[PDB]
Amino acid sequence: DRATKLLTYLADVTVNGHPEAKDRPKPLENAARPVVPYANGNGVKDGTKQLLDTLGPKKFGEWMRNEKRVLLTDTTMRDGHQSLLATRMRTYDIARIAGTYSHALPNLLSLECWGGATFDVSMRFLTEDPWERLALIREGAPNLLLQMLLRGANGVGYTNYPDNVVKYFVRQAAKGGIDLFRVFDCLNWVENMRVSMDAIAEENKLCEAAICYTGDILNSARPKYDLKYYTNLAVELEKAGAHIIAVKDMAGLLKPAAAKVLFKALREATGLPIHFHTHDTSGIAAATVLAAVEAGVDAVDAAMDALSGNTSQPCLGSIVEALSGSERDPGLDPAWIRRISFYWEAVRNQYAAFESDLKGPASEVYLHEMPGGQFTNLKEQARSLGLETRWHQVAQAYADANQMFGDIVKVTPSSKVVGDMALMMVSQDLTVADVVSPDREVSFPESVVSMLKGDLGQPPSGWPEALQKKALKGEKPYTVRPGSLLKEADLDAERKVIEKKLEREVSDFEFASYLMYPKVFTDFALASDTYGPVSVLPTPAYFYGLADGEELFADIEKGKTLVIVNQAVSATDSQGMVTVFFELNGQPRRIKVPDRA
Amino acid sequence: DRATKLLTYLADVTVNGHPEAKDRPKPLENARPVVPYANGNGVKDGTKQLLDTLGPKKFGEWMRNEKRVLLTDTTMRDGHQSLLATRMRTYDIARIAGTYSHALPNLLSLECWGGATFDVSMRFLTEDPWERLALIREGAPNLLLQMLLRGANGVGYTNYPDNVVKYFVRQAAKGGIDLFRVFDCLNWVENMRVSMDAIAEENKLCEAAICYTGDILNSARPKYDLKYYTNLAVELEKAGAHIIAVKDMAGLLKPAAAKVLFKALREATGLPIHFHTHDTSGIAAATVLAAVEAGVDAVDAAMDALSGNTSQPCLGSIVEALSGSERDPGLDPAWIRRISFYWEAVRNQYAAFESDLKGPASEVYLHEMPGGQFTNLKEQARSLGLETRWHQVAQAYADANQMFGDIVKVTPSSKVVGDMALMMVSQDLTVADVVSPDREVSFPESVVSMLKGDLGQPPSGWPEALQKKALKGEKPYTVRPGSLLKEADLDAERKVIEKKLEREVSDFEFASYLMYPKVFTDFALASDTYGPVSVLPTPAYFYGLADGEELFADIEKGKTLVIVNQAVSATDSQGMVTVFFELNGQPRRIKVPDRA
Amino acid sequence: DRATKLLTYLADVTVNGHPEAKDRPKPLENAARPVVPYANGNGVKDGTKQLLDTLGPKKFGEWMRNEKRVLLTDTTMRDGHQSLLATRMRTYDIARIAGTYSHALPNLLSLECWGGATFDVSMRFLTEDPWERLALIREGAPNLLLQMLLRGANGVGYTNYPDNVVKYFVRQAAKGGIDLFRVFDCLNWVENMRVSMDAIAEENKLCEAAICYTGDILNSARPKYDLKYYTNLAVELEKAGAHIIAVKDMAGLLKPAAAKVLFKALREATGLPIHFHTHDTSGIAAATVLAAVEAGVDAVDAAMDALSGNTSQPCLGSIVEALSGSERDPGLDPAWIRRISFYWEAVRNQYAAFESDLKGPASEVYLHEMPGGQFTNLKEQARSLGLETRWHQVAQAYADANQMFGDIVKVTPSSKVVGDMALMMVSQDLTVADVVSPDREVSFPESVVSMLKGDLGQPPSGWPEALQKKALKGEKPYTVRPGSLLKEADLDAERKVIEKKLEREVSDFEFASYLMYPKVFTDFALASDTYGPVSVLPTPAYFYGLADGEELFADIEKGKTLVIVNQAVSATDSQGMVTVFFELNGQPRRIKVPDRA
Numbered sequence A, C: 001d002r003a004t005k006l007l008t009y010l011a012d013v014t015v016n017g018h019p020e021a022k023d024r025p026k027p028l029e030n031a032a033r034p035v036v037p038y039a040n041g042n043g044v045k046d047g048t049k050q051l052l053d054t055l056g057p058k059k060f061g062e063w064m065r066n067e068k069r070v071l072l073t074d075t076t077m078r079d080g081h082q083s084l085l086a087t088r089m090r091t092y093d094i095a096r097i098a099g100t101y102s103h104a105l106p107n108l109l110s111l112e113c114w115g116g117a118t119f120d121v122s123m124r125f126l127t128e129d130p131w132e133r134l135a136l137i138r139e140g141a142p143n144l145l146l147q148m149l150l151r152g153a154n155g156v157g158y159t160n161y162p163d164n165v166v167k168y169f170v171r172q173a174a175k176g177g178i179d180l181f182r183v184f185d186c187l188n189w190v191e192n193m194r195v196s197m198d199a200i201a202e203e204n205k206l207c208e209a210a211i212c213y214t215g216d217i218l219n220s221a222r223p224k225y226d227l228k229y230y231t232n233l234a235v236e237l238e239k240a241g242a243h244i245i246a247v248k249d250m251a252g253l254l255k256p257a258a259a260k261v262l263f264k265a266l267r268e269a270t271g272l273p274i275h276f277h278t279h280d281t282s283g284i285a286a287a288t289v290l291a292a293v294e295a296g297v298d299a300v301d302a303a304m305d306a307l308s309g310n311t312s313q314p315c316l317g318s319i320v321e322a323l324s325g326s327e328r329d330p331g332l333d334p335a336w337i338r339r340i341s342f343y344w345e346a347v348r349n350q351y352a353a354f355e356s357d358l359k360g361p362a363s364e365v366y367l368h369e370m371p372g373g374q375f376t377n378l379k380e381q382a383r384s385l386g387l388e389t390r391w392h393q394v395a396q397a398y399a400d401a402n403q404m405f406g407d408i409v410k411v412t413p414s415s416k417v418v419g420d421m422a423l424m425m426v427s428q429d430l431t432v433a434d435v436v437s438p439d440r441e442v443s444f445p446e447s448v449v450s451m452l453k454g455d456l457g458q459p460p461s462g463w464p465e466a467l468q469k470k471a472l473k474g475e476k477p478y479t480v481r482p483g484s485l486l487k488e489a490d491l492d493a494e495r496k497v498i499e500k501k502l503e504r505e506v507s508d509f510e511f512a513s514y515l516m517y518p519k520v521f522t523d524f525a526l527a528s529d530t531y532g533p534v535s536v537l538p539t540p541a542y543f544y545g546l547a548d549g550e551e552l553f554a555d556i557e558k559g560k561t562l563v564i565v566n567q568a569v570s571a572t573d574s575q576g577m578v579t580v581f582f583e584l585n586g587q588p589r590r591i592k593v594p595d596r597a
Numbered sequence B: 001d002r003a004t005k006l007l008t009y010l011a012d013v014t015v016n017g018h019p020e021a022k023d024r025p026k027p028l029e030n031a032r033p034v035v036p037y038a039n040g041n042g043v044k045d046g047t048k049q050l051l052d053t054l055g056p057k058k059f060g061e062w063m064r065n066e067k068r069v070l071l072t073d074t075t076m077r078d079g080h081q082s083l084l085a086t087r088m089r090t091y092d093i094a095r096i097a098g099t100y101s102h103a104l105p106n107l108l109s110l111e112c113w114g115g116a117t118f119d120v121s122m123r124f125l126t127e128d129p130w131e132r133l134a135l136i137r138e139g140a141p142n143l144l145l146q147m148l149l150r151g152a153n154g155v156g157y158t159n160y161p162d163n164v165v166k167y168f169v170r171q172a173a174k175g176g177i178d179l180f181r182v183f184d185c186l187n188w189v190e191n192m193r194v195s196m197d198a199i200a201e202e203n204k205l206c207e208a209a210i211c212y213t214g215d216i217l218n219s220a221r222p223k224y225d226l227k228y229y230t231n232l233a234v235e236l237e238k239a240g241a242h243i244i245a246v247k248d249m250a251g252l253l254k255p256a257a258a259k260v261l262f263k264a265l266r267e268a269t270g271l272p273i274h275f276h277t278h279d280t281s282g283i284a285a286a287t288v289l290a291a292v293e294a295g296v297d298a299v300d301a302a303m304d305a306l307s308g309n310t311s312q313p314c315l316g317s318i319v320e321a322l323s324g325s326e327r328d329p330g331l332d333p334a335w336i337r338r339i340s341f342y343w344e345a346v347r348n349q350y351a352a353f354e355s356d357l358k359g360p361a362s363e364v365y366l367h368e369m370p371g372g373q374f375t376n377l378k379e380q381a382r383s384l385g386l387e388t389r390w391h392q393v394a395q396a397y398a399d400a401n402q403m404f405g406d407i408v409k410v411t412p413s414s415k416v417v418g419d420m421a422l423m424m425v426s427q428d429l430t431v432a433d434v435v436s437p438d439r440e441v442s443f444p445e446s447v448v449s450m451l452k453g454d455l456g457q458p459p460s461g462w463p464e465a466l467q468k469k470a471l472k473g474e475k476p477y478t479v480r481p482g483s484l485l486k487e488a489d490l491d492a493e494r495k496v497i498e499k500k501l502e503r504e505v506s507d508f509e510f511a512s513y514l515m516y517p518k519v520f521t522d523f524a525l526a527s528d529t530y531g532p533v534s535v536l537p538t539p540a541y542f543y544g545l546a547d548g549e550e551l552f553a554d555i556e557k558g559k560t561l562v563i564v565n566q567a568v569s570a571t572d573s574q575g576m577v578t579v580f581f582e583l584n585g586q587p588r589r590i591k592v593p594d595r596a
């Protein structure tokens, strides 16, 4: 029956395509099935996971600090496909390689493999459970730390959530297999990081409190984001009880010379270890990573070659190959990095529908400051409102818009607020001067009014008086922390409304999903109950179903594999229905679905 | 299995089309034929029971004394033979027999057998001609079933041995034939005797025909004059005929002609007379109505929907012309129409085999092609790239006949003159350059054969010069062809067909082999593969089953199978396609090869 | 400028098609053009035209009677193609053969080549002038009578017209070249034929008064149309001044045995000659014609083989071939008959778009009694309304309607009334009883209300009272001649109308056209203005234009033959025009026309 359901899905998509895929380019026909590399050996070597179990967090941070080799985080499973393929990478492809990482690269610090947009996108667009994805990775890689991106008070969403909800989700994140929380507030406002960090320590997990990098410390004329700004914030996050400090260079704006100064002062300001995250939009980000190493940074992020470069992280294989034989050599087999790259490359080819038209490097990023993760999002969106031809003015729009809001930190969610503003500015031909004008009738987005009201929090100086006094149009503003002014959700009451809605008891993880994404979880559950475990299908099947005569092997369960052949399709019938003719484990099956077209 | 076989056919044709159909016009995707509603009664005794009571001699007398003209319906033979390449199926013919039986019990006969039907049924329609006959016999047990029998030529195109003609007739009668219209392609009485005697030994009706050619009222063409027709009549009576027929195979007999002819026929012989014509001129009905006013005993017509042009003239109107008169035939005009509206719905299913003939042509009086040739020869000429010179071909046919002495042109002589004419247009040959001694030609296998004496002998006998040229060495003969041909060893020619089909066959099955060795063999093969395909309705037999379509088929009477084409696979790697069926609510999958 | 207009026509048709053809079957591509038969060279022999001019109409009638040979009227140029090709035969093909008829068949009585539906269809569907077509025929056949069908008070229209319009039209037709006017009333009402008859006599032309035939005089269960009905009407028509009596068997109903009695009784009831017209729908009309011949009829109509049979007249070659050597041998060389029929066959292949799917004779005609020239039309109108599968019920409803009307003569325009009636009964599923039912509302067609009102005149025993009273909804019927209630047309004023609308003087022939068909004529004149003398185009070019690369020869005048090549056709420009690139006589011409798609 769970099989009946999978046939139903396969039929529904063989006849009607997938909505996210049907509109876009399709993979090369000949196409190798990606092949998981045969692991050399039997057991897996103890690594950083077992160390955090022995040491606990504080002592684990200290261990990084004293460690001489540079430690590595692989982002391929998260920021990587988020940046190059709109976060569409499936569990099937992700989980399947975890064990290979475990055997072939036991020295790694962590796998960045959860959080960010994956939580939203897995359900909403990939019709699979992100907690299930996490478990599968936990299972395959019991020797590596598992890393998530946590948007501080925004959680895995886009608006600040009630304190008890941040508290609750973190508790669940932990029980699900998350070892390492890279947490960050989108305005670098510490006072809005406390509840989150405190919750991470309380579950006795790693609190890597991030500081988002913007501007240019070596430019005297841009004084707001100088070196003293960062060094204080580092000291402040230590006070607030970080186990590790990260520099989140979300836009890939930190330049090598700047690293060399920054990571020296940072290590001078705190004893806690330092972890550097950048994106490679400039085409120079590896330089900034290598500069950060020489200056003594304890840990860096990179993506597998095959999903590296451009708006992603810089190239893991080449960064490692650069350090090879150096005092700080991170002891990672290049041969194995390359076998895993060849696999991710074959995985990548299956997601052709989601490839951007981005050609290569751009120093334009120093002007606009858009985050690696955004960029392509905003460009398709600017396509959507008919602006593909005016894109470079939409980049000027973004930068003026930034200076308008007072020269702010721009990252999820804050970035989207700037994005939504830039698109309007171009569309309705508003200068920043026409934007802030008394006599000019502007109708701001539901996300601009929201942030000016005080919902993403508060920057250092506060918001600009005038821009806000127009943008609120009578709604009075608040400067207090958004979690303080939101009632503490009655958890036991919300769990009845979702359990009644679905006429069943949901798991504690499931209640977390609904808490973060009420409507999206509900739509996913209904899809779940209708199509079943769609996540066990290999990717070409999940997006295009089965060709005529195509044999499929699918493992609904454990060691229960199913042999599904699509042997024919019928014409559309009097009832508007189509019948797909499956052979399942040598047995005939007839499945009817609607001709939606 | 019986069912499995058919499903394989439906798959092969659904996928590959039918070879005789796939490149020609389709019917309007848009009315299945409906057998008209049963009137409840049992069936009135007719001519069949009368024949059984009187015997053929006295039955023949009884036609003579009948005052009402008697009628023979040809829709089931000459009619589709002439308009549809003889391609009408058993399914459509059998299904209406019972309606004729109940609704027109006055009919003399149904002409429903022989002619091209024996051949074509197996060769292009994958059905048994004897089964067709038997089902018509069962539907209409009260009417005479009439075959056209080409004399020494049987159901074939060449003179057969005496013993084989003996054998075939014997089986025809076992199979349900009551009335043998027997003719000879050169009106050669010597060559008719073997048939005639075999028809009388079976105690069936021998209707000995005279083919009509020329124009009896044109003094400038004095070969084919009255005496000629009224002498042959007296000869055929003395040969022991029960009826005489005029076979106007090409529609040449004119009304003024009929009137003289039929009076004088009746004066020469006491036997009844039966008139057959085609309407290629557009006036044959007036020849038929002339013939009646002159006392003719019986006439042929076809149902309205398959009448006109190269077919017989229109039954329904001819009857209506008579209605109320002293010779009124007593046939209900509403039932005629009902049956015609059936043949009309039937006929639309055979769109693939329609000619492009627009109407009447007085040209027939020039060329003299038989109705049941005309289209055949326009198609074989399109097949020699000549469609733009068809009128030069008709002139050649006329010139060719003059060349052969001025002969009777009916099957299979008609083909012989066709084959020559078609050569003359292509190879650009005047009859002067055809009989020329300096110009070297290569005559058809048909024409060499007729001139050596294989189809018989014209009254003069053949022109020497044409003979001794074509004969290129070969010494001709002037005797009866079967007098020469070795009496086939029937026991021995039986085993050769039984060791090749690896089973016993019936006397009827043997008869088909004797007439068509190579054709029966190919039909038996397919029958064991695809099964009783005769029982499939006619849009399925030619085009298979469209998607989601639901069909109904009676394998065995009181055993109907519901067959539904639910799906058709794309081709597989090994070159096969899989049709997915539902037979009586059970799923079946049938693999058929792709011959594209 | 005339050449410019033809090119514009050729362009339009080439790039948009011809409305009447573009969605029907096309002629065979190979298509041999029609060849006019080469003439032996011998002069044109005086014939029935010279005789009429010498004797005048009364003594010409007398000369017909006394003639021993049967006389033939060829119908190919009018009823042939009206009945088989929806009257779409063109002047180009028709006129080009007149001189052959004249040289080859000089004994002919007449060519039936004008009136009936041709007057209308020529303007409306062929964009050509019927006066022109007649002149061309007159010019080609100076030795033969030219014969029209004139619908008594209905003219060449579908309704009774004021008397003075009827007089005017007949005056123009005599001027235009008509020698022999077959005139008929749709209800055999002589009172309603006198104006027509008198007008024909006043022009000194042959007045062939028709009695329409229906029923079965030999069937005493149908007494209304018995032998004395026919013989009495002949006597009355003689008293009204006919020079010739016709029997118009417009549905081919007369059987041979009835002909024997009818024509002997007619030649005894009146000394005038008798002319017999019938259709071959039944499949036996040749039998009936040869019987009329045997009985002493004076003239019979037939159609050339290639447009005979079925709903047309019966075959001329075979009729003659059957009379040949007889006492009444008509003296027509059938060799030449066949040569001319062969031309007509080639002409006919060009009109494949207009062929019907009639397969042959139908004894069903004795039941429905549909005129030959209505049949196909009505069968299409029924298709039009979704009634193809039910044709046979329309034919039965037509019979029933005919009896519901009291049992009436069905011919243009009464036949159309009965058809509207049948169609409605079948669409709406009404028996005759329902139709006259007190509790059942019926909205009768206008042609039916109007007939029962009296507009088509009076049948011998009046209209059935109860049907009439229900059909008219309180309107009062009348029993006078319809034309006695119509305003005299103010001729001088109406001429000033059409002359103001066209901004030029018109001819008397054009004005008679206007008087018969105001809207249609006005459209035709406007078209002539735009497209020039399109009647001079050969028929394939008229309906399909020119293929790419095609060379066409065309005579706008005797000494001037245009050579036209289609060299290229453009894509559709931004103004929605397409530019066709022609060569005219070696010179480049470019014609823009609209893309109408």
Ligand SMILES: O=C([O-])C(=O)[O-]
Pocket: A079, A082, A116, A117, A149, A151, A250, A373, A411, A412
């Ligand atoms: O999706 C995110 O939160 C990101 O990477 O900034």
Ligand SMILES: O=C([O-])C(=O)[O-]
Pocket: B078, B081, B114, B115, B116, B148, B150, B249, B370, B372, B410, B411
């Ligand atoms: O088959 C035949 O012999 C025929 O119809 O002439």
Ligand SMILES: O=C([O-])C(=O)[O-]
Pocket: C115, C116, C117, C149, C151, C250, C371, C373, C411, C412
């Ligand atoms: O057009 C006509 O009047 C006719 O022939 O019925």
Ligand SMILES: [Cl-]
Pocket: A517, A518, A519, A520, A521, A522
């Ligand atoms: Cl949601």
Ligand SMILES: [Cl-]
Pocket: B515, B516, B517, B518, B519, B520
């Ligand atoms: Cl054979």
Ligand SMILES: [Cl-]
Pocket: C516, C517, C518, C519, C520, C521
């Ligand atoms: Cl009008």
Ligand SMILES: [Mg+2]
Pocket: A064, A065, A066, A067, A068, A069, A296, A297, A298
């Ligand atoms: Mg370190």
Ligand SMILES: [Mg+2]
Pocket: B063, B064, B065, B066, B067, B068, B296, B297
């Ligand atoms: Mg008799």
Ligand SMILES: [Mg+2]
Pocket: C064, C065, C066, C067, C068, C069, C297, C298
């Ligand atoms: Mg006379």
Ligand SMILES: [Zn+2]
Pocket: A079, A250, A277, A278, A279, A372, A373
């Ligand atoms: Zn990132």
Ligand SMILES: [Zn+2]
Pocket: B078, B249, B276, B277, B278, B371, B372
């Ligand atoms: Zn025949």
Ligand SMILES: [Zn+2]
Pocket: C079, C250, C277, C278, C279, C372, C373
């Ligand atoms: Zn007519």
